[PDB]
């Protein structure tokens, strides 16, 4: 976060720089990224609650813990 | 992967999605002398400036710079995504990623003599023999610290080297001492 | 030079220079600042070059005080890495780490300067003609003989010894010694070093009316320094010794206080140099420059450097890595265990761990060796029976062990010495002893001839004949 | 003369042929008193040396994304930080031949005695893998060491890897050099390295070698604390390559690693300076990798690979009498045996100190000679008996004969274990010694005079029975007439010595 | 698996990190064979296993054998699966390495 | 340490 | 009250005050020192001072040294206790006597800060919880506490009478500890032990009792 | 920079003002009997003690030769 954050993958930063002040937020969708020990740093999802269950493509489930600046950890 | 090189690859991505790679390279070339004149770069870095003043003078710049709208979008996003303290390094670091994804490669000739077009073309042909770029751009400088002729630093920005110069005398001293 | 430096980030005692990107000096080079002070700008603080952080910023620690300095204030570079004026000029003056005299007399000539960072001497040039020098302090002379020209290791807790020992050692061996000396004062108390300077004046070894008669030079890195000075006053004392080894070609005994102050100053600054913490919390580059300081002190067929290092083990924690390294560095080690002087057995050198490599019988006169091994065995028996004497009572054990405990108790009480400056703690006058005198004394004790006398008769004794005088005095005063 | 030097100059400058090949190069970002970082080098491999601009050579350890860290093999003054540095391509070999015997060197194996340049033709990779399990074999050849108990209780064999973990400053270097001097007899080239000692100590040790004549066949690679971190980091590797190479030339070899604790200390120093993230007790994770790659390099060969023998006898000393320190518990977890040379056991007067308590051997007795079993099994029993029932000595006065006589024999065997500093006492000196000890032909004597009794014993019989020397050296097996001659000499010498 | 040829980005000792194109990135615990550029001229190949994604098309593995003599930016091939070790009933009396290649100079096993 | 060495002493 | 000065600093008042107020005491010390009158100073609760320094220092991300304290605390307390001294008569005998108190961690003096400040100061003096617990008021752990100045900073009469009584008390404590598990102690040892316990009684003070020097002589 | 007054009322955007002097607590007579807290504030309802020296809070130690031998 100080040296390296995980909100600067090339795809999300190109998705950002294709338009500055533009259309709606990816409120229930986004790109999963940097999967640590069950730690998912997905970008987007600006309507997700604190402690919200999230469902995945593997069928595994996840729980929102740290809703950060741009990603959701 | 530098933090800067992330956004350098982003600029490569927009130069990919359009065909203005030379236009955005001329735009970032205008931008490196825009973010020269250290009061200017300091003012835009200067982390206590009100951001709306930053974006309004930024729109003034975009009006006067003559950028493409995507590389115009780039400065605004580098403002808002707060990484403004390395932007001159970003403008530098766009060079090699543009060089790579363009398909060329870069090197430097350091001779005692200003090498002509045929000689530099033969040298670029030997470089494409040892590297295989598309339109390999080898700018040069003519430095009298050498003795004989051409030295090449190619591959990456300074990685690998061949030469026929003052090395042929200094390593001659080295291979005469022989200890 | 022409690199007008600029100060960028003042981080406590560690600071930095912004440079013109063309020209930067190298490691350990001097960097004198154009500092200001409370009035005017006649302030000049030096800075030492450790490492350079890539894009025209370097890492540098100031020696003198880091107060009152602004960002962008200019500094001046030298190119000469701190050439310190050591020759015959330095004799009898308290000097600073900047090569500056502090004893409010005139500045001496700086013709004989030499840089404080340099190459350690080569391996092959190394004088090994092994012979002992004597002191007149029984518990080290009998037990752990001091190699002339080697190093001496004095380890102790804070308040167990190490100060009256070194005072008595200079008091004996300086006037016994034809060569000049050096005391470095690296981070001891300012009062004690002052009192040493007063003692030196009183002894007449300086003869403060004359510089050229004075057989010593002084350098005091006191506690007021920022640690950049505290890590270089040690090597200032080193180069003061080194000029006397090379350029003066005479033998010099060397007196240093606690090196643990020096390495802990390194531990203090390594956090802020841009380096990382280490094993238990010191600096990582411990043994490297530690052994630099060590192996820049040896005897190499041109002069003899015998040396005494008063390294303070913290709180008697012998697992500490820097004294662990110094253990293998040294030649004659004496740990000064606190539990002894807690029982008041002044001086409190442990007879068990303490040794030298000079215990060769073929160098020590084999009867001496037999004596020493016998008495160390005896004390080992006492300390191992210490577990059960406080459990089984005095007279559960066998009668051979009984007389063993009695005679060992008498010899460990006989380990005292009334030093010639201990009088501010005893009041009894200081006493000087021989070597063969003590040999005969310890043989007559442990052979069991006067093995009936009171245990207090053998206490604070010069020797065993003095003990017999105190024995008759005690058997007078006991009945009356 | 000088014109011949000029023609040597001429032949070398005609040997310069303007070789045009590609060299990797880069610029100095930062140097940090041991650490140096440069960027722009990809094709350098792991563990490769480069050469700087000034002449200072350095080796590369971490190939980071942006830059590359190189660590320094010398004095880092003249680094310019903006200057260019180049690569080499070699994997830090060292040149090698026979002529090192009696020479002393730095970590680069370059001479420092000034006794000429070692005429080294062959060379070797430093980071060589250990020989495989198929090249490994069992142990048959006994290693000799001269000491009574460690010839006796934990024997050492040519090929295996025994370790001594005596504490601070109590006699490890001594007994190491006593093994060296005990190898005056055979053809074995011991390998001495000394790490992190003062130069005066190692000079004193090698002058002891000069006196005893070890310098005809020894080798010292002494890397004192003056040197930078990488030199002491890779110096035992250089000694190991020397050992393995000369073992490949079918010779019998052993090695004395001095203070692998100092090796590991230097390693964690330079590594943590290099921003290797620290692990247990601030040592980085691969300290076990270092010690395993150093020690388990030593092995016993295949007898079609030449049947050279390599025996690793390293030294680690531990802070203040500990077992549970980090690198000691690592090296006991890795190597076969161990030996505890404890401080109070030395200070008690046992010369030298051997704990015969937790001192165990994985190989046990399998490497001893055939006569050694006969002379030693009863010794093992008697030592177990005294070590167990020892505390009754305070009233063994009152106890019966079966414990009393046995305790007296046990303690006089502990007095037999005493041996002086550097007395080379090979197999025939000691088999008779342990023999009369276990036969009780001296238990009438009291508890001091046995040492002079034994030295007069062994001198007289070593002069008196050269046929006993021969049948020791030939059979390595106690035949009954050998033991007969032995008891005869015992009775004669005991008679003469009792009459004084 | 396929030709997922990525650059060996960052090497700090036995920890080595390999970049990738953004299309295919290997899974966790996934065996990756490095075509090990050896000093001996032959491609003495080494393997590794990634128990740490980096997210930025970059993996974090350690190698089973010694990583010395390995440069920056060699190519790599994934297995697309964890360590497929050729075990079975036919592997009797043979000595194995970690990845299961026979080592006691008796040739290969099934 | 200081305890742990002393605790070693006490154990012994 | 006319010659005492308090510079009070409680805890909830913020950390800057808790760092700098002992140096304000040092400022008063330095002034009254250069006005050449004798003046003492009793620094107190230095563990609080080092703790508040740890707070303010760690809150500015100076990477802390051993046991999470910052490293300059040695430099701190040196910079404190090197101030108080006695000037010579050349500058005019301006004296400053300093007595810091440090809370050792629950009877344990082997913690971090007391090692450092013992290396700083000259003399230590221990308060045994054991002897105060047994009622020896006030409790001096005799023998283990010395003065680096020694008796040269005592009056001549005290050296003239009893300049070994520290040593002699140490001797008696040794012999008594050994003689507790004894059986047949000599009349010499008896008189030594009994007169030592007489001196143990002589080390008893009713509290707040003003005493003169001759009153102890 | 570190606060001395737990600055609730200290607010962002406020420019800070420079002084150019080290901490120098004013010290004179009439201190004999009074209680301040590091700021020359008599906190017992005393009043004000005027002072003129105002020596530096951080000052160099006295000179080593001018340190006296401790006899008294
Ligand atoms: N068999 C022996 N008889 C008598 N003395 C001995 C014997 N062995 C060793 N010593 C003495 O013990 C002392 C310490 O020995 P030594 O220096 O070998 O300890 P060390 O721990 O190996 O040294 P280092 O700490 O350098 O490893 C030596 O001075 C030596 O004189
Ligand atoms: N031999 C001795 N005779 C009398 N007092 C001693 C002796 N050794 C030590 N002391 C006392 O113990 C103290 C130890 O010396 P000290 O100045 O504490 O040096 P260090 O702090 O290096 O131990 C001395 O101040 C002295 O009071």
Numbering used by the authors:
A (entry chain B): 1 to 73
B (entry chain d): 72 to 250
C (entry chain F): 17 to 496
D (entry chain C): 5 to 504
E (entry chain E): 16 to 125
F (entry chain g): 41 to 52
G (entry chain A): 219 to 435
H (entry chain A): 74 to 145
What does the primary publication say about this deposited structure?
ATP synthase is a molecular motor that converts energy from a membrane electrochemical potential into the high energy phosphate bonds in the ATP molecule, which is utilized throughout the cell to sustain its life by hydrolyzing ATP to ADP. Chloroplast ATP synthase (CF1FO) from higher plants has a unique redox switch that serves to modulate the ATP synthesis activity. The CF1FO enzyme actively synthesizes ATP in the reduced state, whereas the oxidized form has a low activity. Our cryo-EM reconstructions showed a complete view of the enzyme complexes, composed of α3β3δγεabb′c14 subunits, in different redox and rotary states.
One sample without DTT or IBZ treatment was taken as the control sample. As prepared for the functional measurements, three different protein samples in detergent micelles were imaged: reduced (DTT), oxidized (IBZ), and control enzyme complexes. We further focused the density refinement on the F1 domains, which have improved map resolutions from 3.0 to 4.4 Å. Although the density maps generated from the control dataset could be categorized into three different rotary states, they were generated at relatively low resolutions (5.2–7.9 Å). One explanation could be that the control dataset was composed of multiple states, conferring a greater conformational variability in the population and thus flattening out the high-resolution details. Comparison of the three different redox states showed that rotary state 1 was the most populated, while rotary state 3 was the least populated.
